[PDB]
């Protein structure tokens, strides 16, 4: 039955996607990359650059 499969499977998916992001930042070593990582302070980063 669908709802249950979707529930747990998407649980796995979002748990992975979370880990994926933590993995992204950890592997790269940058807390901030883009409007999705910093819609706000990156502008001041440009200024200070």
């Amino acid at each position: 039955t669908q709802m249950m499969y979707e529930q747990n499977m998407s649980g796995i998916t979002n748990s992975q996607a979370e880990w994926m992001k933590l993995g992204e930042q950890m592997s790269t070593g940058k807390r901030v990359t883009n409007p999705s990582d910093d819609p706000i302070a990156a502008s001041q980063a440009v200024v200070l650059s």
Partner: protein
């Protein structure tokens, strides 16, 4: 009397029909597009007549399509909203990745 044979055999017809409804229910459960189909059938209840409570009236009524049409169309509207928001956010992501670079 021997109509009992018939009577019972109408019970058999009801069982077979219920079985086919069950069969379509189970076989199509994962089909993209399906709704539960419960079987329906009558009773030899207290409708008036001239025979009394003899085995007059048990037979298969048909099958329904159990779907909340009201929330189904409301769901189509919600799908319109999601379509718009999701579409434009993906197109946003396309630029976002380059400013990510």
């Amino acid at each position: 009397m021997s109509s009992l044979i018939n009577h019972a055999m109408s019970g058999l017809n009801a069982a077979q029909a219920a079985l086919n409804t069950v069969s379509n229910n189970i076989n199509n459960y994962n089909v993209a597009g399906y709704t539960r189909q419960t079987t329906i059938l009558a009773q030899a209840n207290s409708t008036l007549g001239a025979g009394g409570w003899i085995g007059n009236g048990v037979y298969v009524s048909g099958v329904q399509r159990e779907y909340d049409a009201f929330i189904t169309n409301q769901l189509r509207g919600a799908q319109n909203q999601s379509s718009g928001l999701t579409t434009r956010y993906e197109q946003m992501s396309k630029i976002d990745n380059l400013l990510a670079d």
